[PDB]
C-alpha cells in the first residue's frame, strides 16, 4: 500500500484514535484525513499546474502535520520551518527554494517573504470552506518526486523523495520493533529530520504523536508532568535530551511505566546514558541509529544491550539497512579495508537526490556508483563485520602539538573520568591556529574544597588514558550543557561564552 494509504487506513479502522497531541490541542486520524483532504483540494484549486515546494511555518501545533499531508496529497513537497529558525535564514529559504506558498499554524512574524502567506484564520477558513472535499488520488507525490525538503544549518535544502521516505519508514517500523497504536514522543522540531523517525513510523502504525515544545523544555516541572501523562511508549530524541531528563531523579520506569523502545540519533550516544536508561527502564530496549539528513534520517541501527555496553566502551552506530550499503574511504578513492578508518560513504535508495538547486554543492557530496546515488558524510569511522563505528566529523579533527587529535574522542575519555557528568571540549584558537583546549564540564558529586583540586584530579585520571598533549589546559564548570533548539550540544553558544 502507498505510504498515504497505510496512513489513511487508520483514519478508517481507528477514526477516533488520537493521531497527534500538543498540550491540550488534539486531532484524531479522522480529522487529520478530513482536514488534510480539504487543504489538498484547496492547493490544487489554487495551483492547478504548479508543484513547487510549500513552506509550513510553526512549531508543535497539530496543524503542522495536517499541513504536511495536505501538501503531499496535492503533489507538492513541504518545507518544515520551525519558529526557531532565524528570520534571515527563513527569507533565504523562501527565495532559495521555488516556494510560492507558505502555510502557517500561528502568526508569521518574520518580515514578509516573497511568497503567498496563508495563516491562522486563512488556514481555518480553508478547512471549513473545503470541508468534505477530497484531492485527486493521482496528485499524491510519488516515486522520486520530492516529499519534503529539510534545510541544513548553513543553507542547503536536502530533497527527500517518496521512495526515500518509504525506504526509511519501511525499515524503521521493521527493525525498531514497533507495533501499532503506541504513543510516540516527538522532541525534535520538524525542521530537524530526527522528527521523521517518529512522525511517519507512528502514522503508518496508527500510533499517537505526543509533542513536547520548546517552552515546556525550558520549564522542567511542566516537561515532567507532561511526560507523566503522556504514557509514551516509543521515545525518539537526541542523546543530549535524554541525558538532561536523566539529570532528573524521578525520570524512570515510575514516570513512564509503559516505556518499551528508545530511539536515539543525531549525536554520540554516551555508554553511561544508555547504561542509566537500561537501569531506569529495565523493560525498555535501547536503539542507537546513525545517519546524516542527506540520507533520510538514519541508515544504521543496533540494539544496545548490557552485552554491547560491556564490550564497547564507545558505542557502535549499528548495521546498515539491507537495501543500502556503506563504504569507508581513505585519502584517495582508496576503499579502506574493514577495520581501518576513513570517511563514511552511503549508497542506496535512502540517499537524497541532491541539494535543491545547487549542482555546485551537490557536486562534491553526491555521486553515482553502479547506478545508485552515493553521499560522502564528512564523518570518520570504520566497519568491522558489517558493524559501523563512528569516530567523529572530519572537521572536528584538530591539529595541536604537531599532533592530530579528535574532539569526539577526547570528550569520550573525559566523560569517562570520575566527577565528570557532562563534558564538551571547546578548541580555543589564538590568531588563526588552535592555541589550546578548554574543557567545559558538568561536575558530579565531590568533596573537593577548592576548584583547582577538582581540576587536578580530573586531569590526572584523564592523563591515564590520553597523551599529555591531549589533556585540555583549561577547565570550566557549570550546572548544565546547553542544547540548541534541535536538542543537540550547543557548541556555538559555548565557544561564544568562552570568548566573552
Ligand atoms: N548515532 C550517532 N552517533 C554519533 N554521531 C551521530 C550519530 N547520528 C548522527 N550523528 C552525527 O550527526 C550528523 C548528522 O546530523 P544532521 O543531519 O542534523 O546535520 P549536522 O551535521 O548535525 O548539521 P549541518 O546542518 O551543519 O549539516 C552526522 O553527520 C553524524 O556526525
Ligand atoms: Mg552535515
UniProtKB/Swiss-Prot annotation:
Tell me which UniProt keywords the record has, alphabetically. Answer: ATP-binding, Cytoplasm, Ligase, Nucleotide-binding
Q: What is the annotated localization of this protein?
A: Cytoplasm
Q: Which GO terms describe its cellular component?
A: cytoplasm
Asked whether the keyword Ligase is assigned, the reply is yes
SUPFAM superfamilies on file:
Acetyl-CoA synthetase-like
Q: Which reaction does it catalyse?
A: holo-[D-alanyl-carrier protein] + D-alanine + ATP = D-alanyl-[D-alanyl-carrier protein] + AMP + diphosphate
Identify the EC number(s): 6.2.1.54
Q: Which domain of life is it from?
A: Bacteria
Pathway, according to UniProt? Cell wall biogenesis; lipoteichoic acid biosynthesis
> What are the recorded GO MF terms, alphabetically?
ATP binding; D-alanine [D-alanyl carrier protein] ligase activity
Q: Where, by residue number, does ATP bind?
A: 152-153, 288-293, 379, 390-393, 488
What Gene3D superfamilies does this protein's entry cite?
3.30.300.30, N-terminal domain of ligase-like
**Record PROSITE patterns:** AMP_BINDING
The function of this protein is: Catalyzes the first step in the D-alanylation of lipoteichoic acid (LTA), the activation of D-alanine and its transfer onto the D-alanyl carrier protein (Dcp) DltC. In an ATP-dependent two-step reaction, forms a high energy D-alanyl-AMP intermediate, followed by transfer of the D-alanyl residue as a thiol ester to the phosphopantheinyl prosthetic group of the Dcp. D-alanylation of LTA plays an important role in modulating the properties of the cell wall in Gram-positive bacteria, influencing the net charge of the cell wall.
**Name the record gives this protein:** D-alanine--D-alanyl carrier protein ligase
Amino acid at each position: 500500500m502507498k505510504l498515504l494509504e497505510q496512513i489513511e487506513k487508520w483514519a478508517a479502522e481507528t477514526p477516533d484514535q488520537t493521531a497527534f497531541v500538543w498540550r491540550d490541542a488534539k486531532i484524531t486520524y479522522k480529522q487529520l484525513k478530513e482536514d488534510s483532504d480539504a487543504l489538498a483540494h484547496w492547493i490544487s484549486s489554487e495551483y492547478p499546474d504548479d508543484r513547487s515546494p510549500i513552506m509550513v511555518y510553526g512549531h508543535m501545533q497539530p496543524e503542522m502535520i495536517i499541513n504536511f499531508l495536505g501538501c503531499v496529497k496535492a503533489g507538492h513537497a513541504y518545507i518544515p520551518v520551525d519558529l526557531s529558525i532565524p528570520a534571515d535564514r527563513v527569507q533565504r529559504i523562501a527565495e532559495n527554494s521555488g516556494a510560492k506558498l507558505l502555510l502557517s499554524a500561528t502568526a508569521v512574524t518574520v518580515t514578509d517573504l516573497p511568497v503567498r502567506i496563508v495563516s491562522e484564520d486563512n488556514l481555518k477558513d480553508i478547512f471549513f470552506t473545503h470541508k468534505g472535499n477530497t484531492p485527486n488520488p493521482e496528485h499524491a507525490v510519488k516515486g522520486d518526486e520530492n516529499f519534503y525538503i529539510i534545510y541544513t544549518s548553513g543553507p542547503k535544502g536536502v530533497q527527500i523523495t517518496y521512495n526515500c521516505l518509504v525506504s526509511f519508514t519501511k525499515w524503521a517500523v521493521e527493525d525498531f520493533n514497533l507495533q501499532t497504536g503506541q504513543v510516540f514522543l516527538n522532541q525534535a522540531p520538524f525542521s530537524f529530520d530526527l522528527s521523521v523517525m517518529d512522525i511517519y513510523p507512528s502514522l503508518v502504525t496508527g500510533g499517537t504523536l505526543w509533542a513536547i515544545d520548546k517552552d515546556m523544555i525550558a520549564r522542567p516541572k511542566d516537561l515532567f508532568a507532561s511526560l507523566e501523562q503522556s504514557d509514551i511508549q516509543v521515545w525518539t530524541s537526541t542523546p543530549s535530551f535524554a541525558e538532561m531528563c536523566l539529570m532528573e531523579a524521578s525520570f524512570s520506569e515510575s514516570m513512564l511505566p509503559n516505556m518499551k523502545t528508545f530511539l536515539f540519533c543525531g549525536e554520540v550516544l554516551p555508554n553511561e546514558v544508555a547504561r542509566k536508561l537500561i537501569e531506569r527502564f529495565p523493560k525498555a530496549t535501547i536503539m542507537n541509529t546513525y545517519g546524516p539528513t542527506e540520507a533520510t534520517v538514519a541508515v544504521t541501527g543496533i540494539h544496545v544491550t548490557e552485552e554491547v555496553l560491556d564490550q564497547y566502551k564507545s558505542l557502535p552506530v549499528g548495521y546498515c539497512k539491507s537495501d543500502c550499503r556503506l563504504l569507508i574511504m581513505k585519502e584517495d578513492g582508496t576503499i579502506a579495508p574493514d577495520g581501518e578508518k576513513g570517511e563514511i560513504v552511503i549508497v542506496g535508495p535512502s540517499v537524497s537526490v541532491g541539494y535543491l538547486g545547487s549542482p555546485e554543492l551537490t557536486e562534491k557530496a553526491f555521486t553515482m556508483i553502479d547506478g545508485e546515488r552515493a553521499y560522502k558524510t564528512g564523518d570518520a569511522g570504520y566497519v568491522e563485520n558489517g558493524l559501523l563505528f563512528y569516530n567523529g566529523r572530519l572537521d572536528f579533527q584538530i591539529k595541536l602539538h604537531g599532533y592530530r587529535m579528535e574532539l569526539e574522542e577526547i570528550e569520550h575519555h573525559l566523560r569517562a573520568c570520575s566527577y565528570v557528568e557532562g563534558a564538551v571540549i571547546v578548541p580555543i584558537k589564538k590568531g588563526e591556529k588552535y592555541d589550546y583546549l578548554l574543557a567545559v564540564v558538568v561536575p558530579g558529586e565531590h568533596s573537593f574544597e577548592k576548584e583547582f583540586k577538582l581540576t587536578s584530579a580530573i586531569k590526572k585520571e584523564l592523563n591515564e588514558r590520553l597523551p599529555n598533549y591531549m589533556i585540555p589546559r583549561k577547565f570550566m564548570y557549570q550546572s548544565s550543557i546547553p542544547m540548541t533548539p534541535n536538542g543537540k550540544v550547543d557548541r556555538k553558544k559555548l565557544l561564544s561564552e568562552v570568548t566573552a
